[PDB]
Amino acid sequence: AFAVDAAKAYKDYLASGGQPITNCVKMLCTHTGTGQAITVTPEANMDQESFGGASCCLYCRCHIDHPNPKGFCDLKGKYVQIPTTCANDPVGFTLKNTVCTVCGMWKGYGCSCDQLREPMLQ
Amino acid sequence: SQAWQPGVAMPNLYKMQRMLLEKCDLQNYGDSATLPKGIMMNVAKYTQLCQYLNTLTLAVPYNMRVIHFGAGSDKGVAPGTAVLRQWLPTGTLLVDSDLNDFVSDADSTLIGDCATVHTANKWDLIISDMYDPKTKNVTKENDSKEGFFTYICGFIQQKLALGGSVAIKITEHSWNADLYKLMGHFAWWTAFVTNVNASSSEAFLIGCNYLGKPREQIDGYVMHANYIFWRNTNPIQLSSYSLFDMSKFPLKLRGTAVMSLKEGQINDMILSLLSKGRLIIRENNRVVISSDVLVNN
Ligand SMILES: Nc1ncnc2c1ncn2[C@@H]1O[C@H](CSCC[C@H](N)C(=O)O)[C@@H](O)[C@H]1O
Ligand code: NA
Ligand SMILES: [Zn+2]
Ligand SMILES: [Zn+2]
Numbered sequence: 024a025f026a027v028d029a030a031k032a033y034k035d036y037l038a039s040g041g042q043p044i045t046n047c048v049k050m051l052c053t054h055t056g057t058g059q060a061i062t063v064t065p066e067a068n069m070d071q072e073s074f075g076g077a078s079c080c081l082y083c084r085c086h087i088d089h090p091n092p093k094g095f096c097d098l099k100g101k102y103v104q105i106p107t108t109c110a111n112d113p114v115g116f117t118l119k120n121t122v123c124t125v126c127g128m129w130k131g132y133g134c135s136c137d138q139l140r141e142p143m144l145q
Numbered sequence: 146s147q148a149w150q151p152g153v154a155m156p157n158l159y160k161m162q163r164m165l166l167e168k169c170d171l172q173n174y175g176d177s178a179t180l181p182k183g184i185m186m187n188v189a190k191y192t193q194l195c196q197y198l199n200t201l202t203l204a205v206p207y208n209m210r211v212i213h214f215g216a217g218s219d220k221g222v223a224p225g226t227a228v229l230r231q232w233l234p235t236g237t238l239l240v241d242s243d244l245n246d247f248v249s250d251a252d253s254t255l256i257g258d259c260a261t262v263h264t265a266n267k268w269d270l271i272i273s274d275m276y277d278p279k280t281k282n283v284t285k286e287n288d289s290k291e292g293f294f295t296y297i298c299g300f301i302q303q304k305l306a307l308g309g310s311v312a313i314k315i316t317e318h319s320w321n322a323d324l325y326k327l328m329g330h331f332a333w334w335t336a337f338v339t340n341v342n343a344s345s346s347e348a349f350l351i352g353c354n355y356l357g358k359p360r361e362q363i364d365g366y367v368m369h370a371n372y373i374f375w376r377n378t379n380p381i382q383l384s385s386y387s388l389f390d391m392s393k394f395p396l397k398l399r400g401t402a403v404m405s406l407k408e409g410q411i412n413d414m415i416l417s418l419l420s421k422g423r424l425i426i427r428e429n430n431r432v433v434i435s436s437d438v439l440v441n442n
Contacts, residue, residue, distance in 0.1 A: 046220035048227045049183045051192050053391050063235050064395070072183070075227030075250045083248045084221070100230065100250045110183070 029087055030118055043112035044084055048075035050102060058104060059127040060120075065102045072110040076101040079113035097122075106132050148340065148384040151196035155336040155348075159371045160363075166287060166370040169317035169346040170377055178341045178385040186341065187218065187274075189388055191228035193339040194312060194349055196387055196394065198232075201353050202332075202422030203270070204308040205399040209237040210268045210432060213251065214259050214297070215275030215314070217243030225274055226251050234398040240434055253434060259296045261437035267306040267427035273297055273313045280319045287318055289365060294321030301327055301355070306427035307411070308401070308419040309355045312337075317346035317373060322365025328352050329363040332420035336372050341388070343381035348372065354419050357411070401425050 037043065050073045056066030065073030076098030077083045082090070089096050098117060106129075109116045123134035147153050180189055211233060216223045226241045226249045233239060241251040242262055255262050259275065275293045297313060298321065305311065313324060315336070328334035331352035338348050403425045406415065411426070418424035 046185075046218075046222050048185065048188065048222055048224050050227060050231055051181065051184060051188065051388050051391050051394075064231055075222070075224075075230075077248045077250045078222040078227070080248075086246075086248070100252065102231070 027087065029081055029085055030090070033081055033115065033118060037112070037115055044081070044114040046078065047113040048078040049110070050074060056104070058133055060122040060129045060133070061097060061101050061103055061127075063101060065104075067104050071104040071106055073102045073104055074110075074113050076103050079103045079105070079117050081114050081118055084114060104129075148382050149386050150340065151193035151387040152337055152339040152343070153379075153381050154197070154338075154351075155372060155375050159375045160368065162371050162374065163367055164370040164374040166366065166373060167377075169373045171344060171346065172380045173344050173383060176344050176383045178343075178383040180341070180385055181388055184388070185224045187224035188228055189341040189385060190339050191225040192388055192391075192394070193341055194337065195228060195232040195396070197337050198310075198312065198351070199393070199396060201310070201351070202420075203310050203396070204306075204354065204401040204422045204425045205234065205396060206269060206401040206403045206425050207236060207398070208403075208429065209234065209270070210266065210306075211237055211239045211270045211272065212264075212268050213239065213241040214262075214271070214273040214293070215243055216241035216249060216251070216254075217245045217247035219245075221247050223247055223249040223251065223254075225272070229272060232394065232396050234396060238432055240432075242436075255434060255436040257436045257438075259293050259300075262296075262434065263437070264304055264432075264434045266430060266432050266434075267304055267309070269306055269309045269425055269427075271297075271301065271305060271309070271311040271313070273311075276314065276316070276319050280316070284318070289322035290319060291321065294324055297321075298323045298327055301330075301352070305355045306403075306425050307355055307357050307415075308422065308425040309427075311352040311355075312349045313352075315348055315350050315369075315372075317376075320369050322369070324350060325365035325368040326359075326363045328368070329359045329361040330357065331355055332360065336375070338376070338381055340381065340384035340386070343383050346373075346376060348376075354422055356416055356419055357408075403427065403429055405429070
């Protein structure tokens with residue numbers, strides 16, 4: 024049953040005061056993108072920074088299996104949009120956050136699927 | 146004036162001179178461009194290279210095949226590969242390689258000496274940033290270098306589709322006479338210097354539209370001396386200005402035609418289409434690559 028849990032190990036490491044994983048590859052972009060979480064090309068808006076996905080994935084960076092039967096990675100080969108207030112730790116952000124399966128925005132950082140129905144606009 | 150360009154291409158008149166080789170002494174050697182916040186030098190460098198490649202007649206078929214040599218960094222990631230994948234159309238196949246292990250956004254990554262890399266298929270674009278660490282730590286008579294450059298020359302002559310292009314990184318000391326001679330096998334070529342790294346003797350030898358045969362006989366030792374003469378006499382101002390406007394960065398998907406023509410069917414009309422970036426000649430078989438593994442106890 025034994026299984027290494029790198030996710031909780033990185034969260035505990037940060038909680039203690041450990042320096043977040045560095046050298047995440049930040050991309051040059053217009054910052055006029057859709058703001059979606061994971062995209063085929065940089066889609067950062069004015070409140071985000073776009074990074075190469077593989078460099079922001081704990082499993083890719085630590086050279087360890089991905090936590091899913093197929094061993095598939097959702098970041099590798101794509102671009103991840105990280106809020107500027109969290110761009111100092113992109114690996115930690117992708118771990119602690121979830122992409123909305125409906126709008127493609129991060130939960131709590133873009134997804135508005137739970138807000139009230141705006142009085143309809145003409 | 147050139148400060149707002151992504152970099153500077155060697156003027157054509159230098160290709161027709163017969164300069165004697167000597168030290169590359171750059172006037173702007175002790176300068177640095179203002180890198181945008183949190184942007185690595187290699188992201189800036191590849192972004193300017195891609196900005197310049199956008200101005201050339203690159204063949205861009207659907208299902209484009211790109212191979213990137215020297216893609217690893219001492220950081221354990223692939224900044225250049227991330228820029229190439231941002232630049233290339235979404236359906237483009239990207240394979241990268243390096244002597245050292247690294248994490249990449251490429252479709253496939255091969256670790257080991259490029260000499261161990263094999264492939265049954267032809268490629269549409271070859272990018273190389275390979276540079277031997279000894280070239281730096283050890284200085285000696287500036288003769289043609291024959292390590293990974295011999296592999297690149299063989300790879301261009303056997304695995305590059307006609308109409309395909311290359312961007313091979315060279316420096317004052319990291320260069321090869323046979324590679325310059327092969328530039329004569331392309332419809333057009335140049336030495337491109339990125340404005341962010343203009344304080345370095347570094348340049349990308351760009352071969353545009355491979356013809357599989359020499360349109361011009363080039364003496365590699367003389368052409369490298371011509372390149373050094375240009376770098377020594379035309380100072381390039383360090384500049385990061387082109388990095389702030391990424392609106393027209395993506396390579397336009399031209400949908401260039403791919404045909405599996407024979408060597409006896411390559412007439413003057415075909416060479417003319419290849420020379421305009423309007424044709425790619427190669428089969429479209431399943432892309433298969435591998436890295437040799439030395440076995441020993
Ligand atoms: N014979 C060879 N085969 C493969 N890679 C080689 C090589 N000689 C040198 N290299 C690689 O060339 C690289 C030069 S540094 C490359 C930086 C990288 N392009 C980036 O985007 O940051 C080194 O990683 C080195 O390992
Ligand atoms: Na792209
Ligand atoms: Zn991963
Ligand atoms: Zn949502």
